Amino acid sequence: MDAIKKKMQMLKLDKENALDRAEQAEADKKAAEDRSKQLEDELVSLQKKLKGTED
Amino acid sequence: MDAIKKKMQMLKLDKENALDRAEQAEADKKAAEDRSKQLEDELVSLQKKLKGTED
Amino acid sequence: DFDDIHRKRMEKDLNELQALIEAHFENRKKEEEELVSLKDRIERRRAERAEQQRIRNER
Numbered sequence: 001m002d003a004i005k006k007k008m009q010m011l012k013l014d015k016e017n018a019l020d021r022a023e024q025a026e027a028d029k030k031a032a033e034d035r036s037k038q039l040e041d042e043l044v045s046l047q048k049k050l051k052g053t054e055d
Numbered sequence: 056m057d058a059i060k061k062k063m064q065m066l067k068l069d070k071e072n073a074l075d076r077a078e079q080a081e082a083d084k085k086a087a088e089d090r091s092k093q094l095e096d097e098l099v100s101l102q103k104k105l106k107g108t109e110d
Numbered sequence: 111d112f113d114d115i116h117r118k119r120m121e122k123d124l125n126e127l128q129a130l131i132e133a134h135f136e137n138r139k140k141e142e143e144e145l146v147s148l149k150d151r152i153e154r155r156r157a158e159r160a161e162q163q164r165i166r167n168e169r
Contacts, residue, residue: 002131004059021073022076
């Protein structure tokens, strides 16, 4: 009819916005966790270098 | 009718799924970010003690 | 944000659209009421034509 189509369009705009936000948040999580794990690896290498210096 | 109900329910389900997924991702992002901050703070002190050891 | 104004815009869009939806609902509803009254007076016309035709045929 008439109002039904507009209501469906609203329900679809919500769909697109929610899905896009979810995808963007997932990408953010991937990037942040990669950052953290690379920092942890750098910390490990520093520990090993400290061990060599102690030797 | 029949089509309106199923389509509307499926679209609302899609919106809710995307929202909850985004919230989970953002929570993990915040936790990883704070842990990364902890890693930075500990790494600086590790560098300082390494520098003293080298001196 | 841009998402906020976009949300308010699609919101008022939904509001005006459902408003016009209920509006044409009411309009076509009045038209259906008028058409029902038309059918009723039509059946009145059928009955009156039937009785007068039958009287003519009786005579």
